[PDB]
Symmetry: D2
Subunit: 106 residues, 4 copies
C-alpha cells in the first residue's frame, strides 16, 4: 500500500485504541498498525524524493519506523497479557514517534 | 516482493556480511536485509495457508519478523559506529532467529 | 546506591543532555543514566513496600525499568554515531517513561 | 552482588528453565536472571581491570549486558502469555549472548 494509505491506517487504528473497551479491539488495531508500519518501511517521502536512498536523511527516516515498530511490539505484549490500560497508555506514548518523524520529514 | 525473493535477499546479504572487508559493505547488506524483513512481514507461508490470518500461528510467525527486524536494527548501529567485527558477530547471532522460524514454519 | 540517589542521577543527567554542546557530554550523561537505571532495578518503592516482590505491581514496576534501559540503549547508539541532535531528542522522548512510572508508583 | 555471584545466578536459573514444568517456574527464574544481569551492569571483569571505564572494551562489555537484558525481557513476555515452550526456547537461544561475551572477556 502507498505511504498515505499506511499513514491513514496508522491514524485510524490509534483512534480505535483510545476508544477501545476490550483487549481484542486493542490487539487487532495494534496488529494492523504493525502491518502498516512494516509496509511503509521502504517508502520515499515527498520531502526526500531528491535525496539518495542511502543518504543520512533516508537512514534517519527508516530509523523512525524501527522505533515505531519496536513500540508497537511491546504494546502488543501488554495487550496479550490482558494489560489493556497499559497497552492504551503505550499507544498514546508512541504518538511522539509519529510527531518526531513528521516534524523532520512530513 | 514475494516471500522466497525476500528470503533469498536475506540469505545472500548475510553471506555478504560474513565475507565483508569494510563498514560500508556491512552497512549496505544490513539495510538490504532490513528492507527484505519488513517486506516479508505480511506474507502467508505455505505451511500456514489454511490458517486464520489472526491465528496463534500467524501471530507467532509475525513475532519472528519483529525479532529479526530488532536484531538488524542493533547490528546496523554497531556498523554505523565503525564496530565492524561486532556487527559481523551480531549478524552471525541473528541466524538463530532465521532457524527458529524455519523449524516451526518452513 | 538507594532509589532516591539513582533518581537524582537520572534527573541530573537528563538536564545535562538538554544543555549539552557536543557528543562526549551526551555520551557520558547517558552512560551514567544507564548505570543508575540498572542499579535501581531491584528497588522496592515506598508505595509498594507492603506488596509481594512477585506481585503484578512489582512486575509492572520492573517492566518500566526495562523500557528505560532500552530507550537509553538506543539514544547512546545515536550519540555514538555523532547524531547528537537526535540523541537529545531521544532523551526528551524517554521522559514519558519516567512520567508513566511516577504516575503509578511515586 | 559481585560478578561471580551474578554469573552463578544466571547459570543456575538457566538450568532451572530447561527443567521447568510450568509457567510460574519459568517466570520466576527469568525475573531472577533479569535482576542478576542488571546488577552485573557496572562490573569490571578481571580481564579488563587495567582498562579505562570508558574504553572501547568496557563499552562493548556493557553492550553485551544490554543484549542479555533485552532477550530476557522478550522471553518473560512469552512466559507471561502462557507460551512456556517458546519462552524455554528463547532462554536456550540467549546462551549465545553468554558465550559471545565470555569468548571476548572471560
Ligand atoms: C502512529 C504514528 C503515526 C501516525 C498517527 C501518522 C499519521 C500520519 C497522517 C494522518 C499523515 C497524513 C497523510 C497524508 O499525507 O494524507 C502522515 C503523513 C506522513 N507521515 Fe506519518 N504517522 C505516524 C508515523 C510516522 C512515522 C514514524 C514516520 C517517519 C518514519 C512518518 C512519516 C510521515 C511522512 C513523511 C508523511 C507525509 C506523507 C505525504 O506527504 O504524502 N509517520 N502521517
Ligand atoms: C536472517 C534470517 C533468515 C535467513 C538467512 C533466511 C533464509 C531463508 C532461505 C534461504 C529460504 C529458502 C527460500 C528459497 O528457496 O529461496 C527461506 C525460507 C523460508 N523462511 Fe527464511 N530466512 C530468515 C528468516 C526467516 C524468519 C525470521 C522467518 C519467520 C518469521 C522465516 C520463514 C521462512 C519461511 C516460511 C520459508 C519458506 C518459503 C517458501 O519456500 O515458500 N525466515 N529463508
Ligand atoms: C529518566 C527517567 C527518570 C527520571 C529523570 C526520574 C526522576 C525522579 C526524581 C527526580 C525523583 C525524586 C525522588 C528523589 O530523588 O528524592 C524520582 C522519584 C521516584 N521515581 Fe523516578 N525518574 C525516572 C524514571 C523512573 C522510572 C522508570 C521509575 C520506575 C520504573 C521511577 C520510579 C520512581 C519512584 C517509585 C520514585 C519515588 C521514590 C521515593 O519517593 O523515595 N522513576 N524520580
Ligand atoms: C545467561 C548468560 C550467562 C551465563 C549463563 C553466564 C555464566 C557464567 C559463569 C557460570 C561464569 C563463571 C563464574 C566464575 O567466575 O566462577 C561466568 C564468568 C564470566 N562472565 Fe558470564 N554468564 C552469562 C552472561 C554473561 C555476559 C552477557 C557477559 C558479558 C557482558 C558475561 C561476562 C562474564 C565475565 C567477564 C566472566 C569472568 C568473571 C571472573 O572471572 O571473575 N557473562 N559467566
Ligand atoms: Zn498528504
Ligand atoms: Zn488512499
Ligand atoms: Zn515489555
Ligand atoms: Zn545496541
Ligand atoms: Zn536505533
Ligand atoms: Zn572465576
Ligand atoms: Zn560469591
Ligand atoms: Zn516479543
Amino acid at each position: 500500500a502507498d505511504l498515505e494509505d499506511n499513514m491513514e491506517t496508522l491514524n485510524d487504528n490509534l483512534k480505535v485504541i483510545e476508544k477501545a473497551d476490550n483487549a481484542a479491539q486493542v490487539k487487532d488495531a495494534l496488529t494492523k498498525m504493525a502491518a502498516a508500519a512494516a509496509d511503509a518501511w521502504s517508502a520515499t517521502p515527498p520531502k526526500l524524493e531528491d535525496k539518495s536512498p542511502d543518504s543520512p536523511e533516508m537512514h534517519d527516516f527508516r530509523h523512525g519506523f524501527w522505533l515505531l515498530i519496536g513500540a508497537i511490539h511491546d504494546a502488543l505484549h501488554l495487550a496479550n497479557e490482558g494489560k489493556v490500560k497499559e497497552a492504551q497508555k503505550a499507544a498514546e506514548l508512541l504518538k511522539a514517534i509519529c510527531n518526531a518523524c513528521h516534524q523532520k520529514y512530513r
